Amino acid sequence: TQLITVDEKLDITTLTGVPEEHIKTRKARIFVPARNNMQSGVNNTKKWKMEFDTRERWENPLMGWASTADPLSNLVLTFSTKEDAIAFAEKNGWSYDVEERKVPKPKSKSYGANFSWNKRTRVSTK
Amino acid sequence: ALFVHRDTPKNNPETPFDFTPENYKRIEAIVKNYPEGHKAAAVLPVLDLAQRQNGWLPISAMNKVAEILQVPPMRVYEVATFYTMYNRKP
Amino acid sequence: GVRTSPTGEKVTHTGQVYDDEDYRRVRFVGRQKEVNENFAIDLIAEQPVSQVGSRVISCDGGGGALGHPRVYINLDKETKTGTCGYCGLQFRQQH
Amino acid sequence: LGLREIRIHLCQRSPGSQGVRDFIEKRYVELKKANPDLPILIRECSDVQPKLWARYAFGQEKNVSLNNFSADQVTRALENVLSSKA
Amino acid sequence: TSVKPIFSRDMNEAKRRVRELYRAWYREVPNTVHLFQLDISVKQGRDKVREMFKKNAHVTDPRVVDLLVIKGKMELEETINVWKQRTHVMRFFHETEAPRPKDFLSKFYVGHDP
Amino acid sequence: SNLIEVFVDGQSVMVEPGTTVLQACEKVGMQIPRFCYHERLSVAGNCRMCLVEIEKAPKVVAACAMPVMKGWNILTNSEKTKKAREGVMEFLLANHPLDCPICDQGGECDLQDQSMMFGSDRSRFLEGKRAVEDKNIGPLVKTIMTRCIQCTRCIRFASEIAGVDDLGTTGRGNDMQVGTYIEKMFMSELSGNIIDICPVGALTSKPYAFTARPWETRKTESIDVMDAVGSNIVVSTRTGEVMRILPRMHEDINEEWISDKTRFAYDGLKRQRLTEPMVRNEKGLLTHTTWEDALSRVAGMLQSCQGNDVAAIAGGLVDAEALIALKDLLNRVDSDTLCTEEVFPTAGAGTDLRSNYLLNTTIAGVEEADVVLLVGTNPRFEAPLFNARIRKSWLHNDLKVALIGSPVDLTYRYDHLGDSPKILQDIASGSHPFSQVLQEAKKPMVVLGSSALQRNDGAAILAAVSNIAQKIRTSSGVTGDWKVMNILHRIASQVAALDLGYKPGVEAIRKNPPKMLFLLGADGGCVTRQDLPKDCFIVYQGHHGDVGAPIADVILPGAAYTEKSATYVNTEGRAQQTKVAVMPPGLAREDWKIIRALSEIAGMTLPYDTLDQVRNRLEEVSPNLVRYDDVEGANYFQQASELSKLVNQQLLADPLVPPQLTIKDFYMTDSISRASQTMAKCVKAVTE
Amino acid sequence: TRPTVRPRNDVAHKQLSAFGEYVAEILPKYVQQVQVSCFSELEICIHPDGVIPVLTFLRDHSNAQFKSLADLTAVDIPTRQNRFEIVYNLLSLRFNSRIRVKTYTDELTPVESSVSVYKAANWYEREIWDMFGVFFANHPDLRRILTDYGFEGHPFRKDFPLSGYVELRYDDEVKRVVAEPVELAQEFRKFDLNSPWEAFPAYRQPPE
Amino acid sequence: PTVKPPTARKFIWTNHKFNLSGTPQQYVPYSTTRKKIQEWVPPSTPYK
Ligand code: SF4
């Protein structure tokens, strides 16, 4: 046979070594990151990311540096699809929420529409 | 040779400029050359008409052409700075 | 151009000084608060404005490749000088 | 001690909410004319099962499932809520 | 859903392995208290073993408990062969760690963590 | 279908006629380089960066402007496309200043990035560059015009979206300068968005200037609360400190813009903040205390209250979690007197049906209307991106706009019918000439402003507007899926407070003034201590000390919208959630955490511990408040209109004047904007 | 493209393609993919039931003789349901060549240990146990090799944080080095560096 | 520097100091930035 049938939910939380505080009190956010509106390039909007809720950052009394106590504060994960991210968060016991991908809707462009005979879409200058 | 404006006491939006009434009749004759809904097409002659009455264009002739043609004043400033005949200095 | 707080503490060129009720002055007890007493904002004001005969001037900070990247400053405003964004030197068209 | 508000959750398109929809199109108005100072919050949503929430005095809330009712059954459940006030 | 097993074909073999690992830890606790010259009792060390076994007591997957038994055997080999120092044994007893706020109100008082 | 087949690098793609070369390349997942093309602006075609080879054609075409012909093979990676890109990038970088270290665009510069990706690696320009005089277009947008590459996104934005027509190009040739030609101050309600679309650092944010740098910032995706648009934003922080606020693209709300209050009111979020709990000492002065002492002194007064002894006013910036928290807390005392600052009329249907207080059409449905009627509102400042959507429909769909109110500037031309409310009785009778326009329009849209509902005849105005909407919809050519009746809200907390069943307006507290008053962020000054009895116990819970906090007895320092994960519902009923960007300063806490801890001190512990359990309660009160980015349609306009016919309230003779007539009144509305030094500079700049 | 561009080696590309076809057709039971990179490196991507038969082939076959195990490697790729990618770099001193043998596993499926083929693997896959949590069946002494003795967690998994979950300090009360939850006096500053523009159009993936 | 002198500047130290560690003149670190959040100062008049 050499194959067993495990009909249970996949759960590796006892094997990851993550302490309980950072399994059951964390909210994973699964999202495609928004395009930086300083720029027109879209190559950062191609993958799904997983991040966590930001915890407390405070001021170091000596230097004024940003002291943290959150180990997961920099943990950003990359996924090809939404279902891979959902499956990875369910496998690790993370409570998650998913934002759907926002695509830009197809616009209707026409250079001649800048010079219409009777429509408001004339450009006053060019 | 500057393409910005600074308000001097001889060139400001309170510099006295207005058309003579015969220049208003000429402006009406100019505006009737273009179709209705395209009154902005009379920016280039009328502004030059303001150069013929005055000799040069302060920023009161540009604003007057913008007022009587119902066009934004920036769109007259663009035409006045684009074209080399419009004297923006006396 | 250093001044002093009423606590007796030197205000830095940023403007940082601890409050009187701030406990973090205790780190300077028996020791010193190291400030630099050559304020760059007070030293770049001491430079003379360069009167040049051109409309666009170039600044590299001096020294050629030992300065900053070479930028071009327009001098069309006669109200205000044209200041280099790197070294802080300022220029005026002489007409 | 007494009823304070009523909350009626339902769907716009689900057939299990249909009688609840049949309640609000016909019998809500003379309900609201009968109870002008009673807030009856109608809340439509996308895929919910129908539900009647009855908040009473001092934070007590009873909870009636209006799923697959007719409009007569919604009328009877709501008038039982109005007549109970417990 | 047909997966390759690690050691156990089902959960009963898995519970057998959990049970033998618990027997080996239970026998090992007095020797661990003695040769690491700990400050705990043998009963307190066996309580910590029972606590660590009950911590994983909700797992229903045979492969996950096979890996838990494998990792427990590894920790046991690191304890018997004296590879751990005293500090690694005493890390199960979070003693210098101050007790965390457990209820809502004290977590409200100390900060922002839920 | 009429789809034509074209080819991008040999790959077939079916495109609509009129689709450009750039959009056809976008449909196969390839982004053509660009500087002047912007998909929300008009096509310019004047940077020439998008030049691409069509094969069997010996000339590159501008992909942003050229429509695809059937059978074209667009060669996005061929040799002469790359040579065109390198030549154009060389001419862009010829006169561009070496300012990348001192420029705020560095790291997030289009010119840098696609010079790295598409231009060469070195220079041939052996000449002296040009230098341009800088401009002063206002206190928001710093202007360094030597960095300008003359892509004219300035001018197209100010003309077509902002509707200003005061930017342009003067001069000719290489001396062509983008500017205003005069000392003019570009202060629109959307004036900071040119910082977004400027691909270079010619237009930067003056408050953000020099402080940070894009690679080190953390990007927290969050929601605007400055109005009831619910604009999706990115709060960019850096080491536990909010740096700036960018927009997120949401196609149905804020397309990719935000307003200037949204963009620049974040500096009020680090001034005048409530950081520690305060109680009154023996001298009657506020003094700092612990959370134990403050919550004990509030709960000891709350246990002595019952019924109408305790009431609560919700402010304009309160999330749905704290709203349902304080509602359940006062319902444990059996208090139903929970109010907002903003009056919505309870006459008739009230807040029972959702359809009579929502923007029922949508923000997106403005694109589908053909006649929009605006009553008693100045939507340019009450909801600036709702007005931007009306302007986009005005410009592209030839939308007919009418306004009943004072003749404000809306950045487009409308039909001003008058300011008296009796015109609402004339359109609802058919004697007015605009009534025939509403009859013959297929998709009419009647938007009542919620600021006009602050008048004492708000029920009469809402009845007249609902009578107009149901006179149209039940008779004229409306399908039935189309929504006509609409209310534009200006307050982020208001729609969530109405879904939870608050009593809008403070008339319930003016009826019987209580001996204990909660103020969740209430800073409108709607209820002062002259309205209360002799020793009312006022508890201010909020994040700024502006209005309600100097009169309070115990101050509960709360979280702001960047400091909590928090549900806000916009004017169309869409529920949205902020995320934690930074933590609240000092001893300040999340708002429902404060109310829940107060409930535990009082011995009336509310049945939730975590944020998810609060949202389960919030789903129990109305399940739309947890279905995020969803607009649940609200039916039953007919039943609300039948209930509105019961009590005939009389229209006042006062004309419909919105409270914000000029740009002066826009910049300071809530406690964050009033604490903002940038908004203070905006007001001082527009008042001079 | 002479001075600054790497010269392409077409002869090695053709030879490694021929040998990749050779191995793919001798062993079709386990070989899933065969690829040769542009810089001429052959990868045999196999099924994990053929770890021993493929590696025994390449070690012992007279046309392969990959007698040396250069390196044994895992890669965490969390978007795959078989997230761990086990990499066998092999060296044939007879034919002066290198091959790469790649397979996969998830957290729970054991990979067969290759100590019977290459004894060099005895520590390498032992490290793959310590760093990734991949169990290796029939390993002689499988245990941790790099982490501390009480270390929970498999660090080179990409969901493991950079600083860990614990940090040590000496405590003079208990006279002992203790482990506490990690608090950084300065947080590691995450830099989002990736450009929003496409860098390599030859690697463009087809969109959804 | 007797043959090739160093270039003189107005900010170069005329007095070179040696290693001051372990003395009262040693370096003590501090945050050179100012306060980030401003607190609300309540009014000093009573509220009646
Ligand atoms: S606009 Fe871009 S390329 Fe120009 S100086 Fe700024 S960062 Fe550099």
Ligand code: SF4
């Ligand atoms: S300032 Fe910026 S947006 Fe305006 S034309 Fe110049 S490069 Fe374009």
Ligand code: FES
């Ligand atoms: S992007 Fe097409 S030319 Fe500017």
Ligand SMILES: [K+]
């Ligand atoms: K910019």
Ligand SMILES: [Zn+2]
């Ligand atoms: Zn310089």
